[PDB]
Design a protein around this nucleic acid. Structure first.
Ligand SMILES: NCCC[C@H](N)CC(=O)N[C@@H]1[C@H](O)[C@@H](OC(N)=O)[C@@H](CO)O[C@H]1NC1=N[C@@H]2C(=O)NC[C@@H](O)[C@H]2N1
Lengths: 100, 82, 215, 136, 100, 126
RNA sequence: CUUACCUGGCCUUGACAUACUAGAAACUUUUCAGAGAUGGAUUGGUGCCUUCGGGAACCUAGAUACAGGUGCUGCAUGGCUGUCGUCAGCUCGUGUCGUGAGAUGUUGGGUUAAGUCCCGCAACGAGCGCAACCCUUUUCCUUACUUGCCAGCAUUUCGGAUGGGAACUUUAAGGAUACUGCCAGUGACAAACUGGAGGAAGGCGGGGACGACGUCAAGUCAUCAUGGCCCUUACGGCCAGGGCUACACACGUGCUACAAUGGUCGGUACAAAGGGUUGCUACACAGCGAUGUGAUGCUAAUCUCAAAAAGCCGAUCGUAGUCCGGAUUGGAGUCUGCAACUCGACUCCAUGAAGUCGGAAUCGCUAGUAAUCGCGGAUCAGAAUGCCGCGGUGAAUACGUUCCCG
């Protein structure tokens, strides 16, 4: 039972899509079979910040930050695939976790 | 109130003083700032000066007082009417 | 009469972030605090090197600081010892190994912060305030921007009653979200208090959206 | 509205009888969005009248509404047809609010029955309005 | 804030870290049921005899830049006044204006 | 054998329609044990009553999300589009009766400085 | 604690910065006096780099320039914010007229949500505003098939539970579509306006963000910065206890009610969004209960908060200050915390106040709106009827501009 599984987290969906696309294209080069990417539900968190220094309760900025997630499976991988993926260059703004 | 499984709370510096007074027979008042200590049976018959914010007011402990906090007998606010 | 921040409003629309890293919720605060420390340190240390933009990346346990400068010789040093010294100081500050990359601006007059710094320096060098902003406006317009607005506020000329002057030339479409507008602010410290300087520079519209910007 | 002319909304026919007038009566009865409670009240009021005198509920309601409709309002002016039904319905439901008897279903059935014969605060309201109109 | 208050917070934060291990051990002893009631009672007395600043209940979250004690926002470590400026000039990754 | 999808106020219904003798089932329950209130049952049954074909089909329905009214509306929409997929000539009649439109009304968000979508706090001059 | 205020106890180059001088690694145990701040003893350790002459870290001791100030001036200022007001306007160059301040352009007929668009004209041309580009929701398509899904087949402990399937719902990236596009009138046979078909949607489909030149010496020296003034054995700094929670009264904003369209008891359905490793906890046992103990999964489309409530069915109460209401008070407890007296939340027993729809007057709202029902979060050891969000059920009325306000 060999199946690599990769999870990606980011604050920018364009960057996360770039990384996932490039990862699957790298794996197909070594020739293993790929399932995904599977988009997972996005986390959205929101904050209300008073803008005035002293007193205006109705004057606020509303900010949000989003966490995007992607999941990929590599099934029946060859010997080249594992070290190629581990060699793959890290892109800033994206967190990648690899599990056996 | 404080949970029964924990037992009563008494400040250590007040407890040592009251125990010394009990072991001796001093009639000198004890002087404390510990408004939060609860009156135990050993406190009965003694004189404790409890701070109220500006002065230490004297309290003679009777049998009924046991179970209350010391600060209950030294009010902190002054009111005489409008 | 209060205007939204021109970069804040179009962040994530046509403009990217000066910080680009991911962190877990329990590391976000420490990362952000150390990044702010780095910015505050670099501003002071390169006050005289025409630094405009600082970009911070954390790929994995390491930091890449990109400094956009118009005087690369001063920042790098005669032999390149200064970049190493800066790398050591920033490594100490961040607690992780750090590296520095220089990005040279080709046209300083097209940049918002450099122009504001020049106006503020002249104002505390006691040049009459109306000459400095006309000079900056015509310099940028000749450099080839599509518009510029300049504003100065405070005790202009050492007067008792403070006031606000401004001067605009060209196009400055603030409400158009896809417009590419650069903005900066500075403080000039004079004998009679603080004077504030604001600059807007418009350099055409960004077509294709953030898909084209490739965020 | 000073700018434009609004269109009255489209109320749906009642499910169990298919009567738009009965649906409107339900909407006048309902409070706080409790359509089920309003429907229970309306049906309980209809069944009492059907049992005490055997008429088809739809026709009986229409005929009683026709009796209760007022021809003049509030300087008399003339009412539009929709205001006729609105005013008649509102008077019909208001009287049952003040009537005796404990439950509202029977309180409404009492007014429905008595208005058919010609006694009821709803009809007295129409009477007073027409006395005022003929006075002016 | 005044410099005295900022230094006072640092002193409290130092004392807490100084006594954390002993405080945790004493609380574990109190929670231990196998130990004798006499042992638990002495553990309680030692915990009550520890210095006041060792208790984490006395720390107050302050802005990392200014020391403001109101409007803290744990996720960033900054109070609202500095949070708004740093966000709006584009130095906090992932945060944007929110509309929905 | 034919399929329809209906939506109304966060509720979604998937409807399978086939030839049969009036067997209708929702979430492995009968209509009367599923919908307690009775207007909901007419809302569900309307599309077949309009076509006079109550006894000519079997309906297998699954619904998720929303409340009792929204689920009934979604089921009605799904039945209508399943019938349209079955026969394209019934669409004029169904559109005339109005069952084809997707009701796009939804809950308005709460706004800053307001108690609700539109309601304001009480105001006073002095 | 916060804390800036009061009472009392203390320190003086200072709790914090730099420069000068000397000595010690820095640090560490245990104990006594005291309310603590502090003071006095008692231990162990004595480290790293080093052209090793020493240096670095850190502390202590001395000296003066200084530090420090939530002290004053928002009428000396920067930055930031409210308001007219999402109101439709506001300006410039070159010409021409006038001794001149100034004027024209920007005016006049339609039309629009709009200085939006068409026509005429000593004016000819530009800029900021309006619209659009941005987010979200409504229909369809492609990519993607797990932790999410179950139409067809198979097993089954009838639990998508299992083998399987990639259909459907969903998740979330990228696209398509709506443009007066077509038909009938209207207008000047301009702009534009009124009806119809198709279509998920028809004339700006709904909501959000975005705030023009300027006004109010509007607000903030207590977020921060900063000119000037002022204190510096005290207006600076440390501590314990108290106060910010007082109470003859007056006002603003809310919550719960005054009941039968209801209260109580039993049975039984249907959400969305969000939080969780110092955390959330399945399950079992103990307790009337808040909770306690053991134990299991979870760094989460996987496990959990979690019971949605109003709703539906059956019973009872029969208009009473009540089987309405739930204030106040006596007694007994649980939890957080070093510690709940002043001054926490919650649980159980008992008690059962005012209140029977509210004077003159005044406020919100035009549709998934008002009304009503529950659910979540930030702050946070604990402490929401406030604030910011989420869905469920779901109305009535608009003839019109005469009057009130802008
Ligand atoms: N708590 C108050 C503290 C004292 C103030 N801070 C002192 C202050 O500000 N003086 C200012 C200051 O000399 C300067 O103003 C600027 N900007 O420097 C001048 C220039 O007008 O005006 C003074 N003020 C005035 N007020 C008066 C007014 O309105 N009409 C009449 C005449 O008396 C006016 N002048």
């Amino acid at each position: 039972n060999q199946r690599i599984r990769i999870r990606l987290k980011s604050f920018d969906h364009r960057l996360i899509d770039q990384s996932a696309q490039e990862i699957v294209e790298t794996a197909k080069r070594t020739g293993a079979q790929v399932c995904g990417p599977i988009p997972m539900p996005t986390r959205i968190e929101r904050f209300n910040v008073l803008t005035s220094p002293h007193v205006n309760k109705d004057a606020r900025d509303q900010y949000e930050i989003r966490t995007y997630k992607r999941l990929i499976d590599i099934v029946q991988p060859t010997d080249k695939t594992v070290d190629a993926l581990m060699k793959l260059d890290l892109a800033a703004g994206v967190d990648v976790q690899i599990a056996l | 109130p404080r949970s029964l499984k924990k037992g009563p709370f008494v400040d250590a510096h007040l407890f040592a003083k009251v125990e010394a007074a009990v072991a001796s027979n001093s009639r000198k008042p004890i002087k404390t700032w510990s408004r939060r200590s609860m009156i135990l049976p050993d406190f009965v018959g003694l004189t404790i000066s409890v701070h109220n914010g500006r002065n230490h007011v004297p309290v003679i402990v009777t049998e009924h007082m046991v179970g209350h906090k010391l600060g209950e007998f030294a009010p902190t606010r002054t009111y005489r009417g409008h | 009469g209060q205007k939204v921040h021109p970069i804040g409003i179009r962040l994530g629309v046509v403009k990217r972030h000066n910080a680009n890293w991911y962190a877990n919720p329990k590391q976000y605060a420490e990362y952000l605090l150390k990044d702010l420390q780095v910015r505050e340190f670099l501003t002071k240390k390169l006050k005289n090197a025409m630094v405009s933009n600082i970009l911070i990346e954390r790929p994995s346990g390491a930091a890449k600081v990109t400094i956009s400068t118009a005087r690369p010789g001063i920042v790098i040093g005669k032999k390149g010892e200064d970049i190493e010294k800066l790398q050591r100081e920033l490594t100490n500050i961040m607690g992780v190994p750090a590296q520095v990359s220089i990005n040279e601006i080709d046209r300083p007059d097209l940049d918002a912060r450099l122009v504001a710094e020049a106006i503020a320096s002249q104002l505390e060098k006691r040049v009459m305030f109306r000459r400095a902003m006309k000079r900056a406006v015509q310099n940028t317009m000749r450099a080839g921007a599509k518009g510029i607005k300049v504003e100065v506020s405070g005790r202009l000329g050492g007067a008792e009653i403070a006031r606000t002057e401004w001067y605009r030339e060209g196009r400055v479409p603030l409400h158009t979200l896809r417009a590419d507008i650069d903005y900066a602010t500075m403080r000039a410290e004079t004998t009679y208090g603080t004077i504030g300087v604001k600059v807007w520079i418009f350099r055409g519209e960004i077509l294709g959206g953030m898909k084209q910007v490739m965020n | 509205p000073r700018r434009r002319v609004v269109a009255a909304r489209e109320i749906l026919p009642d499910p169990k009888f298919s009567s738009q007038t009965i649906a409107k009566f339900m909407n006048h009865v309902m409070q706080d969005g409790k359509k089920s409670i309003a429907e229970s009240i309306v049906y309980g009021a209809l069944e009492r009248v059907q049992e005490k005198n055997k008429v088809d509920p739809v026709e009986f309601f229409e005929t009683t509404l026709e009796k209760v409709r007022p021809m003049v309002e509030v300087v008399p002016m003339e009412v539009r047809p929709s205001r006729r039904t609105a005013l008649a319905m509102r008077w019909l439901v208001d009287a049952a609010a003040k009537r005796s008897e404990k439950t509202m279903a029977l309180r409404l059935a009492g007014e429905l029955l008595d208005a058919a014969e010609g006694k009821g605060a709803a009809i007295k309201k129409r009477e007073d309005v027409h006395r005022m109109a003929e006075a002016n | 804030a005044k410099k005295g208050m900022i230094n006072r917070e640092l002193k409290r934060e130092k004392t807490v870290a100084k006594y954390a291990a002993k405080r945790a051990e004493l609380k574990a002893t109190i929670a231990n049921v196998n130990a004798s009631d006499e042992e638990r009672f002495e553990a309680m007395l030692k915990l009550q005899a520890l210095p006041r600043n060792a208790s984490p209940v006395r720390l107050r979250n302050r802005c990392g830049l200014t020391g403001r004690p109101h409007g803290y926002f744990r996720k960033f470590g900054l109070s609202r006044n500095k949070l708004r400026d740093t966000v709006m000039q584009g130095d906090v990754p992932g945060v944007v204006k929110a509309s929905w | 054998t034919n399929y329809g999808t209906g939506r109304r106020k966060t509720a979604t219904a998937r409807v399978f329609l086939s030839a049969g003798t009036g067997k209708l089932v929702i979430n492995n329950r009968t209509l009367e044990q599923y919908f307690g209130r009775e207007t909901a049952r007419m809302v569900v049954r309307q599309p077949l009553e309009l076509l006079e074909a109550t006894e000519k089909y079997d309906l297998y329905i699954t619904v998720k999300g929303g409340g009792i009214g929204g689920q009934a509306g979604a089921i009605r929409h799904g039945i209508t589009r399943a019938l349209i997929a079955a026969d394209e000539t019934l669409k004029p009649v169904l559109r005339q009766a109005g069952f084809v439109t997707r009701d796009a009304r939804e809950v308005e968000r709460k706004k800053l400085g307001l108690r609700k979508a539109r309601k304001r706090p009480q105001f006073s001059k002095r």
